[PDB]
Design a protein around this ligand. Structure first.
Ligand SMILES: CC(=O)N[C@H]1[C@H]([C@H](O)[C@H](O)CO)O[C@@](O)(C(=O)O)C[C@@H]1O
Ligand SMILES: *[C@@H]1O[C@H](CO)[C@@H](O)[C@H](O)[C@H]1NC(C)=O
Length: 490
């Protein structure tokens, strides 16, 4: 009525606080951070193909502005566009600028092919001192500036390019418009001008506009750029009685467009990562991140919280079933080779040993319990714009509201998931502690009594081999039962 065997669990000097459904902060032995809050100060060129626009934004690269020659033939997963990019040619605008930029970015490549346009008597290749290439008056190398004849001759242009190809074609054309009325008549003389680009099923006609506007690049004049898409079977008719900034061919479009554009000043480095934010690339296995809503590729999901700790171990009590932090007073810092174990005392001395089965059962149910849930990847490429220079009204409100709605919902999911999992992890570890206790209780039958602190008083001599027989499940209660019963009740 003298040896004692105690069942218990590990502990460390100082653990990590986590949140559950029932508790704001409970200390557990180990935990894992789920929110990535650190970014690399560079962008990774692998495994995704990054293309640096450098001084050239993507519109100018499609126009063929000066300094945008490297973008010729370029292929990208993510077009990297610099915020300090510069206009290096004739002052222009694009109605539906955003939509053209999106189409260009998503298509993923600059692959121009040449086509010969036989312009009547009009002269071609008009240039300007605004668009100087090596201080030589030049022009958008994808565009043809059509001017009068020498002999004062603006004739009607009607030529048609037919798409009998295997792909959809992208034509970019423009409409010049001047400053007064002499303008227009010393450059196309017909006044007003006008252009009509059309397909089999679609029209587009432009009325040039003439007036004073600021001296940008030293000109009071502008060009307005449009685009037209021609799918296999359709075609495109160029009508102008003046002012048409003709195309020199068409861009080839991919059937499936899987690319996008990232606008950032961050330099391109030599790291490896499949996730890119406008603050830099992310190198992580965490499921969430608080770095930027603007994120492309194989990225963690963006959330509002700066920290969410997932418990990966039991409650930490140094020195639901009510075992851990319950009838078991505290954990054992000395138990370093297991989560649960046995501590005994008999006539020969004392000992602490780990229990493998219970330890392994807990680890199996807790280790990486998230990988089976929050999927793996989340591969997002072309999305929507998420930050804006100036308000625009209706469309911009919706774009912002959609993203704000998405973020709140995922932040909610992240919060609930962690509290839920942690609640479950704590219950599992408490559960396994008391399964171990109950296992040993059942082994001992009538030979021992529960002392109330996770310990059994064993009512017979139990030497080291006897103790080990209890720990490894070979203890035969019938051997000691006579001795034990006599000690218990007499
Ligand atoms: C095709 C053509 O006529 N190009 C000429 C332009 C246009 O007349 C204006 O840009 C129209 O506003 O004007 C220049 O003075 C310039 O800006 O360098 C000379 C140039 O040769
Ligand atoms: C992201 O979280 C970290 C703390 O983990 C914090 O320092 C940082 O400011 C957060 N980023 C935000 C709030 O944009």
């Amino acid at each position: 009525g003298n040896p004692v065997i105690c069942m218990g669990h590990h502990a460390v000097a100082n653990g990590t606080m986590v949140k559950t459904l029932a508790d704001d902060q409970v200390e557990v032995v180990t935990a894992q951070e789920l929110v990535e809050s650190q970014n690399l100060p560079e962008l990774c060129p692998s495994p995704l193909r990054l293309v640096d626009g450098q001084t050239c934004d993507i519109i100018n690269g499609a126009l063929g502005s000066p300094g945008c020659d490297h973008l010729n033939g370029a292929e990208w997963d993510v077009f990297i566009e610099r915020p300090n990019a510069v206009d290096t040619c004739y002052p222009f605008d694009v109605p539906e600028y955003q939509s053209l930029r999106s189409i260009l970015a998503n298509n993923g490549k600059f692959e121009f092919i040449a086509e010969e346009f036989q312009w009547n008597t009009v002269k071609q290749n008009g240039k300007s001192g605004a668009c100087k290439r090596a201080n030589v008056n030049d022009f958008f190398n994808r565009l043809n500036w059509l001017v009068k004849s020498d002999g004062n001759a603006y004739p009607l242009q009607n030529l048609t390019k037919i798409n009998n190809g295997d792909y959809a074609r992208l034509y970019i054309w423009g409409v010049h418009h001047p400053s007064t009325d002499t303008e227009q008549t010393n450059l196309y003389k017909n006044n007003p001008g006008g252009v009509t680009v059309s397909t089999k099923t679609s029209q587009t006609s432009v009325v040039p506009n003439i007036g004073s506007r600021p001296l940008v690049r030293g000109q009071s004049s502008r060009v307005s750029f449009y685009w037209t898409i021609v799918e296999p079977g359709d075609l495109i008719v160029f009508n102008t009685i003046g002012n048409l900034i003709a195309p020199r061919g068409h861009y080839k479009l991919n059937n499936q467009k899987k690319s996008t554009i990232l606008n950032t000043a961050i330099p391109i480095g030599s790291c490896v990562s499949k996730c890119h934010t406008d603050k830099g690339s992310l190198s992580t296995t965490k499921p969430f991140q608080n770095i930027s809503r603007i994120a492309v590729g194989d990225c963690p999901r963006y959330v509002k919280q700066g920290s969410l700790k997932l418990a990966t171990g039991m409650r930490n009590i140094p020195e639901l079933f009510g075992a851990i932090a319950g009838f078991i007073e505290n954990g054992w810092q000395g138990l370093i080779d297991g989560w649960y174990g046995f501590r005994h005392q008999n006539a020969e001395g004392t000992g602490t040993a780990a229990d493998l089965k219970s330890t392994q059962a807990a680890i199996d149910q807790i280790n990486g319990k998230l990988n089976r849930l929050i999927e793996k990847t989340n591969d997002k490429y072309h999305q929507i714009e998420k930050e804006f220079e100036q308000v625009e009204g209706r469309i911009q409100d919706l774009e912002k509201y959609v993203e704000d709605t998405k973020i709140d919902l995922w932040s909610y999911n992240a919060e609930l998931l962690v509290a839920l999992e942690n609640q479950h992890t704590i219950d599992v570890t408490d559960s396994e502690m008391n399964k171990l206790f109950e296992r040993v209780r059942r082994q001992l039958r009538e030979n021992a009594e529960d002392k109330g602190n996770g310990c059994f008083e064993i009512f017979h001599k139990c030497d080291n081999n006897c103790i080990e027989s209890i720990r490894n499940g070979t203890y035969d209660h019938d051997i000691y039962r006579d001795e034990a019963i006599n000690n218990r009740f007499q």
